Amino acid sequence: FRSLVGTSRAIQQVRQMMQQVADTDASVLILGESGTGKEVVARNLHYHSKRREGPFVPVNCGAIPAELLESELFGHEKGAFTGAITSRAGRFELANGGTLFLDEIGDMPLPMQVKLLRVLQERTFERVGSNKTQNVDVRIIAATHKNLEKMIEDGTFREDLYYRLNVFPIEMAPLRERVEDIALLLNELISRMEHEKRGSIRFNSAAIMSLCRHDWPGNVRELANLVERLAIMHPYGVIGVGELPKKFRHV
């Protein structure tokens, strides 16, 4: 785990709710833009859960071939389809006793949403082509940068799955709504980068104000990118307004 650095009320609330849902087995939904810490939040939840010493299993919902998605999620037994010479355990079976992290749940296709639902209310599943219904034991943590209720109304997300998953919602404020945290965030990212052989910089107040007026569409991950790049261009340097890429200058 990392900790969620920062002193905004938003991030403090996020910490409080994390402390409250962690050692429960409730489905957690983390909503937030790209780069805002949603996976951090998930890994932290997990390592402070009953599952904390079982497996943490990510599932990147839009980055699996549909043609194989079922078998990736639920495993297959030999000769289920063409190419099925071995017998795979699925992400779910892999996760039994741990946490399953559905990364971008809004990109999960509908047939997979119903199957996921069957798992959350029944706690069973079968490998593809297989008869044997295995029980399964995981804690669900899903994340999204999408508007799930809108999708519900566009009929691209299932309402029943929605209310089943969204037991404990946690919202992650975008960086541009937490500028108070940027310096802290900086000190963290730089510290990591030092503890990782990888270089050193620091920022002066003008630079820091400039970065505090930036829109951060990639949020914290964009910030981390900037720290790495600047540490290359100005090794062990102090970063002022004129060292920032023009993109990040706001004076």
Q: Which residues bind ligand AGS (CB under 6 A)?
A: 2, 4-6, 32, 34-40, 143, 188, 220-221, 224
> Least separation, in Å, of the C-beta of 186 and ligand AGS?
10
Q: How far is the CB of 107 from ligand AGS (least distance, A)?
A: 11
Cβ distance to ligand AGS smaller for residue 38 or 76: 38
Q: How far is the CB of 249 from Mg ion (least distance, A)?
A: 29
Tokens of 220: 């914290």
Q: Strands, E, within 127-186: which ranges?
A: 133-135, 139-144, 168-172
The 3-state DSSP class for residue 131 equals: coil
Closest residue to ligand AGS in the complex (CB): 37
What is the binding site for Mg ion (CB under 5 A)? 39, 103
Q: Which does 99 bind (CB under 5 to 8 A by kind): ligand AGS, Mg ion, none?
A: none
Burial group, residue 240, by CB count within 10 angstroms (0-12, 13-18, 19+): middle
CA distances from 157 to 16, 102, 148, 150 (A): 29, 14, 7, 8
Distance CA 102, CA 85 (A): 27
Which partner, Mg ion, ligand AGS, none, binds residue 201 by CB below 5 to 8 Å per kind?
Answer: none
| 3-state SS record for 47-71 | HCCCCCCCCEEEEECCCCCHHHHHH
**Which lies closer to ligand AGS via its Cβ, residue 88 or residue 139?**
139
Q: What letter represents residue 25's amino acid?
A: D
Distance of closest approach, residue 18 Cβ to ligand AGS, in angstroms: 11
Do the Cβ atoms of 92 and 138 come closer than 8 Å?
yes
Q: Between 40 and 226, whose beta carbon lies closer to ligand AGS?
A: 40
Q: Which is nearer to ligand AGS, 71 or 219 (CB)?
A: 219
Cβ nearer to ligand AGS, comparing 207 with 220:
220
